[PDB]
């Protein structure tokens, strides 16, 4: 099939790679407009691949069977209204990130669709992007409407494995955006690697209970105390890391917030629940943001 990759960034050339390695006509699409997207990524075993290939081809845009968009969360939805009148009426757009509320800007989308996030790992170092790990993505329907498009996770699968297909993709999105309220956050503001916050187990709890309290009434199972233990866990086997939003405030790019614990506040805002140390949180890294 005929693909365009929205974002020629690690994501973005990791499946560029992939379609392109099964041999599936493919362009990637660049804010800044260009003919080509360099390719050059190495892969999990250290072997490199790199090729040139076409860029912000409007007519390939306009009989593409795929829009796979892997930019971050705060440019999604822009992006996607740009290219949606050009794109086919008829053709899927899968939209792959971290965070949530991106779906809320595009409910008036006339195409198919759906959302998804992966624990593949990408990482760019300049103009070389590294495979660090292989991993699963997890994709499913957007709305109500969207979900006779289950045939996507097949195809996927033989192009980048492991791909799974949700029903209800929500639940496994809360479960990551769960974490990620606890650890970018605080990680952010107090500029420490993730192990710091083991030394924080209180406070964490707070976040956790307004995390668990949104999430109830959002309709999935879980609980504070689950999440808390949960939290500890992943801060404990990534002791030394850096998060990815401490990495963002680091390199002083904008952060993903407004889709982490900002979208955490719109819900909680929504259900009318008290959100206090999220909200404290959220605005001082909105403020170190501004600087």
């Known amino acids: 099939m005929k693909i365009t990759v929205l974002g020629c960034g690690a994501l973005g050339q990791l499946w560029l790679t992939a379609l392109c390695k099964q041999g599936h006509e493919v362009q990637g699409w660049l804010r800044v407009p260009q003919p080509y997207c360099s390719v ?3 892969e999990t075993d250290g072997s490199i691949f790199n090729e040139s290939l076409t860029a912000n081809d409007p007519d390939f845009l306009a009989t593409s069977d795929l829009l796979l968009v892997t930019l971050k969360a705060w440019q999604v939805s822009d992006a996607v209204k740009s290219l949606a009148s050009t794109l086919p009426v008829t053709t899927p757009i899968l939209l792959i990130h971290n965070g949530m509320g991106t779906i809320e800007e595009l409910q008036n989308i006339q195409q198919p669709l759906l959302m998804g996030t ?3 790992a990408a990482r760019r ?3 070389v ?3 660090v790990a292989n991993g699963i993505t997890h994709i499913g329907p957007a709305r109500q409407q969207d979900g006779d498009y289950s045939y996507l996770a097949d195809i996927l699968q033989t192009v980048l494995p492991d791909v799974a297909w ?3 993709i929500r639940a496994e999105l809360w479960r990551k955006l769960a974490v990620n309220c606890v650890i970018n956050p605080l990680t952010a503001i107090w500029n420490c690697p993730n192990g710091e916050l083991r030394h ?3 406070e964490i709890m707070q976040i956790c209970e307004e995390v668990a309290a949104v999430i109830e009434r959002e309709g999935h199972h879980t609980s504070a105390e689950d999440l808390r233990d949960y939290v500890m866990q992943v801060i404990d086997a990534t002791a030394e890391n850096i998060s990815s939003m401490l990495q963002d405030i680091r390199a002083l790019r904008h952060t993903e917030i407004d ?4 979208f955490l506040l719109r819900r909680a805002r929504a259900h009318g629940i008290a959100v206090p140390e999220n909200t404290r949180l ?3 890294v909105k403020r170190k943001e501004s600087e």
């Open 282 to 284: 959220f605005e001082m």
């Open 118 to 120: 992966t624990t593949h």
């Open 40 to 42: 050059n990524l190495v």
């Open 259 to 262: 889709y982490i614990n900002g």
């Open 200 to 202: 924080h187990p209180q």
């Open 166 to 168: 949700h029903n209800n």
């Open 125 to 127: 170092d300049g103009n």
């Open 129 to 131: 992007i590294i495979h």
